[PDB]
């Protein structure tokens, strides 16, 4: 319904993961923490693209929570926003870029 999905267990994660690459929407996933300042600055950004994009799907995972996940997908710099269709990576924003991460949501799905 146009929301972020906090995803607190790889289970979490995964099965938001598998409905993305099963329904053929795109999913962006912020990589945040909450020691991060430059995470906090984008996070009620993403929160609206979320609300924007509602035909997307928008997850948020906490790297100190899912330190497995992070490390799958070399999560070296927080924020990280990974951009996923048909269960596979194909973008990525390093930062909190709000217009270059929006250009790139736009793209991807259409």
């Not at 994660?13 to 990589?31: E, P, Q, S």
């Not at 948020?60 to 710099?77: G, I, R, S």
């Not at 269709?85 to 909190?96: A, C, F, P, R, T």
């Amino acid at each position: 319904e146009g929301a972020v999905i906090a995803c607190h267990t790889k289970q979490e994660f995964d099965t938001h993961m598998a409905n993305g690459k099963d329904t053929g929407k795109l999913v962006i996933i912020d990589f945040t923490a909450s020691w991060c300042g430059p995470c906090r600055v984008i996070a009620p950004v993403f929160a609206e693209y979320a609300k924007k994009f509602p035909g997307a799907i928008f997850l948020k995972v906490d790297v100190d929570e899912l330190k497995d996940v992070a490390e799958a997908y070399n999560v070296e710099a927080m924020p990280t926003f990974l951009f996923i269709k048909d269960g596979e990576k194909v973008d990525s924003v390093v930062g909190g870029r709000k217009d270059d991460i929006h250009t790139k949501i736009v793209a991807l799905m259409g």
